[PDB]
Design an enzyme around this catalytic site. Sequence first.
Site, PDB file in Angstrom:
ATOM      1  N   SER A 198       0.665  -1.185  -0.060  1.00  0.00           N
ATOM      2  CA  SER A 198       0.028  -0.087  -0.092  1.00  0.00           C
ATOM      3  C   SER A 198       0.764   1.352   0.153  1.00  0.00           C
ATOM      4  CB  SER A 198      -1.029   0.122   1.196  1.00  0.00           C
ATOM      5  OG  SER A 198      -0.267   0.004   2.557  1.00  0.00           O
ATOM      6  N   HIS A 228       1.289   3.642   7.652  1.00  0.00           N
ATOM      7  CA  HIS A 228       0.798   4.585   6.765  1.00  0.00           C
ATOM      8  C   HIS A 228       0.927   5.790   7.090  1.00  0.00           C
ATOM      9  CE1 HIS A 228      -1.600   0.578   6.461  1.00  0.00           C
ATOM     10  NE2 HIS A 228      -1.338   0.783   4.928  1.00  0.00           N
ATOM     11  N   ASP A 287      -0.870   4.363  12.800  1.00  0.00           N
ATOM     12  CA  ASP A 287      -0.715   2.824  12.909  1.00  0.00           C
ATOM     13  C   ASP A 287       0.547   2.485  12.675  1.00  0.00           C
ATOM     14  OD1 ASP A 287      -0.168   3.260  10.302  1.00  0.00           O
ATOM     15  OD2 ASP A 287      -2.039   2.351   9.475  1.00  0.00           O
TER      16      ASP A 287
HETATM   17 CL    CL Z   1      -0.217  -2.677   2.556  1.00  0.00          CL
END
Ligand code: CL
Lengths: 219, 219, 219, 219, 219, 219, 219, 219
Positions: free
Chosen positions: C15, C194, C191
Amino acid sequence: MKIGSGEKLLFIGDSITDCGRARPEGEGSFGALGTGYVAYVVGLLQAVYPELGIRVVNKGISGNTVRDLKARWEEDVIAQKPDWVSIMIGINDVWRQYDLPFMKEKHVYLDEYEATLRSLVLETKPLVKGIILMTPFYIEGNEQDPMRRTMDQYGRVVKQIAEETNSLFVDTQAAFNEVLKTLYPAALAWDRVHPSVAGHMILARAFLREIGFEWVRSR
Amino acid sequence: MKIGSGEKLLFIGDSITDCGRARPEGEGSFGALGTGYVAYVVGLLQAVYPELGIRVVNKGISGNTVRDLKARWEEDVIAQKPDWVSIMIGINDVWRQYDLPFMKEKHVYLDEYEATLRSLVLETKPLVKGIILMTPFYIEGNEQDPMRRTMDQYGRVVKQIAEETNSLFVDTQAAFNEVLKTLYPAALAWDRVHPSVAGHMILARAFLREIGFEWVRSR
Amino acid sequence: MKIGSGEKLLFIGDSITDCGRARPEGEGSFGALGTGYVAYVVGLLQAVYPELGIRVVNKGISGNTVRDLKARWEEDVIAQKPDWVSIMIGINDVWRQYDLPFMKEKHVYLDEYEATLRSLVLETKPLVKGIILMTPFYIEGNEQDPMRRTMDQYGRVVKQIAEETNSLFVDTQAAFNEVLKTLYPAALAWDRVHPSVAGHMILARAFLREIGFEWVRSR
Amino acid sequence: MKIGSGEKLLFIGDSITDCGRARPEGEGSFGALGTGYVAYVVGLLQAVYPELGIRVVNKGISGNTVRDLKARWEEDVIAQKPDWVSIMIGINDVWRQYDLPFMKEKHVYLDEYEATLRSLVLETKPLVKGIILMTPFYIEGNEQDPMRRTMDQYGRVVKQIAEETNSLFVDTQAAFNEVLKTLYPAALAWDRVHPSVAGHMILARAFLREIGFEWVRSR
Amino acid sequence: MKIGSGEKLLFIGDSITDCGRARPEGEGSFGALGTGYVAYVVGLLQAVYPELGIRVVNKGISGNTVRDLKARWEEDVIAQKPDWVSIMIGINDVWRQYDLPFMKEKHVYLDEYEATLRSLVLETKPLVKGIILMTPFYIEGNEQDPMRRTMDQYGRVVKQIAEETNSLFVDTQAAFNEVLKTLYPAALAWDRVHPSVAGHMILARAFLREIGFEWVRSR
Amino acid sequence: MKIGSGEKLLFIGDSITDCGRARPEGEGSFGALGTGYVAYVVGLLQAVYPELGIRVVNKGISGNTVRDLKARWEEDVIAQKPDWVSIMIGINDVWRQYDLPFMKEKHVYLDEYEATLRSLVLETKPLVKGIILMTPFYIEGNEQDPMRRTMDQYGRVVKQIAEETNSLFVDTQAAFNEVLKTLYPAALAWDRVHPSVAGHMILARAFLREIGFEWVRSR
Amino acid sequence: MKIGSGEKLLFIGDSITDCGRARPEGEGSFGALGTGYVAYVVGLLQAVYPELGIRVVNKGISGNTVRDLKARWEEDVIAQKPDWVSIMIGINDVWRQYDLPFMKEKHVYLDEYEATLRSLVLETKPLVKGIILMTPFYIEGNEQDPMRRTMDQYGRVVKQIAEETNSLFVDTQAAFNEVLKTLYPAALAWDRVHPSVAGHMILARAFLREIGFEWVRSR
Amino acid sequence: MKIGSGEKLLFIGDSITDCGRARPEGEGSFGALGTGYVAYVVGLLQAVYPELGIRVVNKGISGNTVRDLKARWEEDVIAQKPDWVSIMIGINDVWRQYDLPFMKEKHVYLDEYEATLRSLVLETKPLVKGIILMTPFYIEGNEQDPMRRTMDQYGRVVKQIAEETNSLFVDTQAAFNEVLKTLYPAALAWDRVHPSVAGHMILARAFLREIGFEWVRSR
Ligand SMILES: [Cl-]
Ligand SMILES: [Cl-]
Ligand SMILES: [Cl-]
Ligand SMILES: [Cl-]
Ligand SMILES: [Cl-]
Ligand SMILES: [Cl-]
Ligand SMILES: [Cl-]
Ligand SMILES: [Cl-]
């Protein structure tokens, strides 16, 4: 009026032709013709020649180059059995050269453009009553702006094709040029391609004039 | 680094500054700063000067002219008690003259622009530690394009006011002009105003350079 | 600048690389590059090296481990014919061990990780101009936090692979570590994975430094 | 069971308490109580003490500090005429010091926290049958993590105020600490604050135990 | 606690089990377990037995009868290789008889129900550590209400199956009955089937009690 | 037909009357009347007595009790200057006693119900040509179900008030009771209050019968 | 061309004029004018008389009668200081008599229509350079259809007022009547009021013809 | 009542029948029957004949002509094994002739219509207990309006088919005609096809009368 009663007029091109038209059919309901020059043309023809009973189909697809047109020609044009086909293509073939100058597979250069467009006309000509070739355009009054300069080269090719193939011919650039003696491009199109209702009326009028539309018929 | 620890840096401007910032506050987050140059400046400062402890506020509003800035100055600038104020205004002031040429009340002509911007800078200056004046810009390489030509005139005003008031000055036009030696405008902004991430990095880098940012701190 | 004119730079990872990029193509339009470090890298390269004409593709997919990368390598990397491939993977391979400690099929342990990552490099190396291996990271300054401790073991493996294969190498953890001498993790990422724009700039800068980017070119 | 028939139990706090409760009322339904510990407490009381006839109100608001509680206390607590008031506040008071370290006005430091919470408890106490003071918590097993360390300090304040005012007391930190002997934080909450259903059961169970709930009533 | 460390507990049934669970996998993320008794059971097991490392899967599907369960048993149960399977089915098999009394193909009568449910147990029993049979229920205190009367006949069949097959057994009706000595059904469920959080806690508790859960472990 | 040409018929009530009617007006359309019995009554009157020229207004509001009707009576009834007022209220007055038994302020007990409804009828009667009093109802065939039993008591109040004030009277309970000789409640309404189209036809038919509607006009 | 350079032309009316125009301003864009005849008129003027420099405002509001126009005249017409005002009103004034025949307060009968429209024209006339009175219309070829017959009466009023006040006059009924020699109403408008693009071109063309527009300017 | 206990009544037709019914099944839940005459018929049958236990299915599809019906007859009618089939078709077969007079493939002329409709009846008749043929309609009181005139010719054909095949018969036009002695079409349907609740009640009543429904049964 070149277009006869009961005949089918099909428009194809890029977003300027598409304008949100219904996919796949592009027919009838104007909702289905989209919200630009194609719809305006149909509206004016119905307002002034309601008895002609002309059927109109919009096969514009946003983003298309002439290479994209050739890829769908059989399904979107031949199979529709039109009597008249109007083509307006070239804007993206050129724009990509300037907005994504390093994604070269997106570009269609002039030699490929000319031959592909000729190939469409020549395939189609024996099958229809007539072809209308509309030049691409760029809403930019400086002939030396690089993108305007390139667009004009594509437009000159269109004109040459139309002469050679005895197609009808609409110089959309010349129509914008007149208005650009007064307005700066942004008044018509922030991006110099996608215009306001006024730009679409410039186009619709230019097309209608080439097909012998009369605003008040003497007939 | 002209900005010092613990200082509050307030950016104001039009959509180029706004970029979807949180209204009304323009502060507070993982996103309140919007998604363009202001966020990038704040990101890079944090990445390279994490210890500086800068608070940063984004009071950009899409569509604003300098007349709009004056109307909200008290609430959006003075009442925030900033230490540093960065202003980038004039794009709309000019653009409305070209995209809505007959709606004259939307235009901010040079006299109104100079007088208003001058007055905001004079009023603000003794209330803060410092002012950064960023020029408006138009992503167009041709100096004789009418809107580029006007925009350069407005930028001269900003430059003059910054000189007279001992403000910092960022020539954002010059930053774009350098890239426009290679790229056609549409590669950065179809509309010649609202650019890609690349354009916002051009802006962020021009801002940082003016405040003495070092990419790798030399100490 | 290691990357040459006309070359294709492809990013792959999880991500942190994906950041909402366009699927499947991940190319060109930055909208299409997503909204994090990949887009920032492209922006800065365009802002400072516009003439290089580098094509960039984002093949990040949120949630991926190295096992997922291997499963799509042929289609997403080999078939794209890149000149340069950047890989950043490991975060999920480790995170799953700690957030879903009893869904063990989600875990990729270090031995499997090392061999799989080596296998990707070795498959790819003969086909490209170069490979850039970015370590995974965890935004947590305590070396003894269990997840940080594990992440560092994966990062040390990455470094070993890069040395052995003569790949370029970016220690993303070391870059965060510097900033974590001042900021508590939450200021960068609630977190710890991110991050804000600032975290993405930490990453983009670290990458750019390893490829010989100059913020002001002397050249 | 400390709570008796016909009594009105009002919970107030931040997002941990709110959990999407109905605003403004926080009462009235199959859902007005939100989806976390307050709903679970009310569910379990109804399942095991259906005859108690408790009315329960949820006045949690996401993002609140104790300063925010003070600003709405009259309208949201005193005017509701509750019999029992449960307070769980401090997470944000602390967290803003770490996630927005330079926005000092968002911080509620220990002096302000102690003075405000103390004052609300003193004012409320003679107006109600009873008060339950729940500590804030941070889902982090390392006592020397800076935010966990501060959060433990704030929890000592709550404990002291409850002792001094003869309020009931729930040590929510201690409840999490027991689970954190087995689970890494991320297994309960990526952000170490907003947990899974499991975390909300940890909270609900710690609340119930304090008010003398029996899972199977011994009579 | 009947359930052992590392084991997989799978729940299947109708909407009361489904509660919006993730399809198809129904696992892990509680988001993925849905928002009712299954999720509450997992939460409480994690809160009180975090070290057990039990994996839980939710295969509930809204609207299902036992005939629907048999149709998906191979894919949704056998292929999952559970160690423990909990079944709660019958509500719809009966409800359809009363809400759509003339769409008889929707009805599953008692003889078919019994044999189908026995067939599921007997297929599954050799493959698992244990089976938990939960009766269906109807939240209605009048034993002579026609739907309650029928439901109780199905529940008595469940009990008989559980005895004969040495499955664990949860009389959900008896658990509601206790609470219905105080509350009118509507306080728990307007429709007498789908209950509030409290109903789901009634169910979760009843299940947990049958598997030897302790609210405070002496262990 | 008790209602005469040119008269304005105003319906007021709770959700049974509202059925998504247009707020605030409740008049004016192809839909302003909502989708239940009021629309059906107006439809059937138009289909069979098109010449009657009735204007019909729907002032139903979901959730209302008679206390809520009193609070808006002046604005929603008296100020509309109706000729006929139809009232159907009491469902919520009762239901809250059962579905929220401990929120006593939401309950409207018999004394408050009788006194309020009586007062609205007395006040309204000399201002209008006529009043239709419809009983509340509960779709439950067992007279000793506690909520059905209470609802029948409230219906006796309505009946008594209509008798005393010479209003028209519709026993909606009796209309449902006839169908409930054949159908279980759930076939008409899962929740025993908000029914299918069939239930709204039961209501519409009971209303029409009272005002002297003929299905085929006998003249 | 009756309209001259620099003049402000304001259109007011009902939905036929509104066509989704921007509220409250009705000016300013690539879309603020809506999507029907007003936009088409402005488009064609710009395409053929770009140098005229006309500002055009759309103050149409869906559903309006002339009574509604009177209520907002000061704010929406007089305060805009227009040079030319175009009015097209009466469709609703009439239509409500037919589609809501018993809601008499929604009707604007001939006396109210004539008196109000006359008064607005008289008041406006000395404040502006000119007024264009467009008749309402009904797309129905049968002169003895009751609504067409009434609409023709209202159009006679408009015609009389325009004659008396020396306003310009557009007989929109006559424009539709010509097309209705060929097309059934439904081909232009299912509801006989809100037409296709073709109907809006009929309207635009009738407006333009009255103000002396030339399709190809003869000079 | 022609329809017997336990029998299946299936409706098919165009939008007037469809009214948003559930696709494909069209059964049971009235939500599933849609919101017009089919649902009203079922409602009234349930309200007055609840014991009959009639199953009703709605196979209406918006836009269909009889040619469309034939194309789906096997799947939508035969395969459903109805006992009674009601057909209402023709509106679109005619409307297309008038709203899209030049897209002739959309038109179904009377000769084709008659033979196709006869073919449906004759295929179906041996398989069912009975057939109900409902005429199409047009809500227009002038017999000489071209579309009304054509519709009546189709309706006369329906009547002839019904006589010849001994099908039940509903003259929907005659039912509207009665109401049109008082109301102008627009009061029922702006478009003269799709009506208000009242139009749907006109239809539902007309159908119910033909099947021997009694509003109050003497039986
Ligand atoms: Cl990810
Ligand atoms: Cl395009
Ligand atoms: Cl802007
Ligand atoms: Cl919070
Ligand atoms: Cl279910
Ligand atoms: Cl209600
Ligand atoms: Cl309107
Ligand atoms: Cl239809």
